Symmetry: C5
Subunit: 208 residues, 5 copies
């Protein structure tokens, strides 16, 4: 006999959780990590500077309100994102809504760590010039919390321990040369607070 | 120990939320301020007089029924628009529904001030003539309450509007020459009362 | 101190509207007036006899179960259509589902009179022949109740007036010559009863 | 002073609605009739053997769990299909999901007879060869229950006979030569039971 | 009089299904079998290495929490998937969301065995090179659980012989030369556990 099973954990999470309440820990912002693992580049237009790509948006953060004693029960459960709070990230230069290609489930660990990694197809406005050259083009995608400023949400790249083209389609007409990520904190007109973002630089080119 | 946290504030807002009730203060109309920050100009057809544009629609208004004492609690919260009343604005010359590219969350201040600023991609019917000339074309976009007349909702350009081209994409095939906002008050045959609107004149041209 | 405010009125409507129940008074059918205000004519094709049109579909009818004494209270409110019964109108020759470009709110008057006027973009299969001539083309659009027969819903064209181009976009590649309506009552092979429709005739042509 | 009105009948149907429960009368299958009233033929590609069609899918069956004494009550009511059980019909050769152009309402008679007649636009994979000839093409469309076998649902062509092109648009680029039906009973490798379908053959040709 | 009817069964399922809870047996992984029956090949593009496929994704697994005594009651029922737990399968190389063409119902047998077989149209990124040769092309489709690792979900190519062109449309411009399945267990850089998938190799070519 155990202390709890998945049904108990999920039941408790659904019964509470509060999807609309940001899990700030006292006076600290929620530390969100986000990185883009590119899977494909389906269309590129050097005249209009538009690209159509697919990527896994690995997203992580902690939500202590989800934690549970796992000394005698499962250590993790897959949870519908509709049942928990998730960062309100947006790509500033996206020109289409994200088309989520995978089941919208996050993975919650008994300590409150949450991983959400949907595969997404989305179009963007970025620098496509040079794509047809050896040095390639460098398309920058900026992602960050849409409505939470720096005192509520911070964004940093996730860690990386693999090739930038690790999961990139070998059948794409393009190939990846380099993928880098840099964090930023920007203040805009509408509001007095600063908003953080991660800038992902996709350096790619048309294959020979 | 505080008086309340985000969970409590959001709970109170959700529980008393009358999304379908315009927050008129007595008999005064709800004063709505609107201004467009252009992000991109994607499709332009001078033959059909049609254009595709991406813009942030900064919308502000006061809803006193949302106010709370923040002396010992958070001063603001991000709230899903489905839990609040929002102006029923519509672009009169739009020929496509608004494609909202950002999380649909409004920011609510403890005094009742609300800010909703979605990034929208929408197609419009306007004058594209001259877009390929030095003077460029001037496309006018009209926005106002669809069902609330002047005595229930007033719409005015945002007083501070200096960032109209601040976020415009340097990668667009077009460039902005000027953005002007103006207010109107029209009476249409269908009905007796007058409906206010804001007219945004986008003077732009094709690079080259 | 008044008798009631919008919050009270909308609360009562939401609690008792009965959206699935046609508001027939005794045994008299619900008199639904339908009037199309043409806003734009977009992608016309004389080869396939298809056309894209944008119009305000002014729809009016009365629902006595919505009336309230507005002696000392608002005499009108905007209500989400999901909270009211609305006629099940359908465009017989439409070849695409209606794209509603406006907030789906109807205006309900204290005496029970209801007005719903969505701006719609929809494609139709009609006669485009002669669109390039001085006499132009005459595209007929048929609209009527899909499941309520003549004894339950009566559709009547509102003899609004002339000036059918009052709200027609000056930027369209086409122009409106004239708009006329007429009432039909058809018995289909599926069923014994008769279903009525208003047939709007749109005579238009490409601007010379 | 009647026995009941529409509000009472629709209240009882909604309250005891078992939308996910096939209403088999004891151990007898549910007898479903279906005939397709072709309204239009919009896209025809003889290269890829694909066609875009608009048709009224006249569907009828009996659900005795809906009946009510109509001595002094309405003889019938229109009911949102989401509140009733409907056959899980699927076109085996469709290559796009059905686009329902009409309000999703079914008509229920006091005896329990039900009629659901959506107007549908759908793309199909069929023989388009000889569409440009005088003999025309014969595109066969197969429709049957997707998850209910012959002992639970039987499917038969509607006995209702009428001009094939009876409601076919006169503005289509094509015209109908003839429409014949055929009832099949097939056994598929996945499952041990037999599944029924109605095969509708659309003999049409392009206009000269 | 029986022990139970479909109404009772579906009611118990609706009340106790727990759709967000994977039905792991005691502590073993849920054995999921997957088999793709190809129905059609459309929109092939050898330049971009993309193809549109229509297939029945035969999916089976066991959920003993659904079992019931059918000695005096129906042995099976069709259940809306929203009322059941279903494997969170995803096609790794799909570049469009799956378009489900059939009613989203699964078949649940009284012993607890579940079958879900939606017909799906979806675009893929794969090797289309050689489609115009006698050897044809070989497009591999990889499908596995997105958030459940090998210890929670195992995926296996159904063990059974079946003509690959059994249900393939005779009107497609392409034909199937052969179809083979391969099982895999993969560890992704994001996570420590291994995730299983089945890779289906579709060898097809353009018909002469
Ligand atoms: N995160 C961003 N990007 C541009 C402006 N902004 C901040 C912001 C703040 C509040 C609301 Cl409701 N919307 C946006
Ligand atoms: N804002 C506008 N534009 C055209 C007509 N109108 C006013 C209006 C009034 C009432 C209802 Cl239900 N809908 C629209
Ligand atoms: N309004 C029309 N047009 C064609 C047939 N019809 C009448 C009708 C009657 C009942 C149901 Cl459920 N659906 C449609
Ligand atoms: N319509 C038919 N005939 C044979 C198979 N099939 C499709 C089908 C049957 C049962 C389930 Cl759960 N899913 C899909
Ligand atoms: N099955 C796959 N493919 C890529 C990563 N992954 C595993 C995985 C783990 C956790 C969450 Cl929330 N999402 C996906
Ligand atoms: Na454990
Ligand atoms: Na300005």
């Amino acid at each position: 006999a155990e202390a709890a099973d998945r049904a108990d954990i999920l039941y408790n999470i659904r019964q509470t959780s509060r999807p609309d309440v940001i899990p700030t820990q006292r006076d600290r912002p929620v530390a969100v990590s986000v990185s883009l693992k590119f899977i494909n580049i389906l269309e590129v237009n050097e005249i209009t500077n538009e690209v159509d790509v697919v990527f896994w948006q690995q997203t992580t953060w902690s939500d202590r309100t989800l934690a549970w004693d796992s000394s005698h029960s499962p250590d993790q459960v897959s949870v519908p994102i509709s049942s928990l709070w998730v960062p309100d990230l947006a790509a500033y230069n996206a020109i289409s809504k994200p088309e989520v290609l995978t089941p919208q489930l996050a993975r919650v660990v008994s300590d409150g760590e949450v991983l959400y990694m949907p595969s997404i197809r989305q179009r963007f406005s970025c620098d496509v010039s040079g794509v047809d050259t050896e040095s390639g083009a460098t398309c920058r995608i900026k992602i960050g919390s849409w409505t939470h400023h720096s005192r509520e949400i911070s964004v940093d790249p996730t860690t990386e321990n693999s090739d930038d083209s690790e999961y990139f389609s070998q059948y794409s007409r393009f190939e990846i040369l380099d993928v880098t990520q840099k964090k930023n904190s920007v203040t805009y007109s509408c509001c007095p607070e600063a908003y953080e973002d991660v800038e992902v630089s996709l350096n790619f080119r048309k294959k020979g």
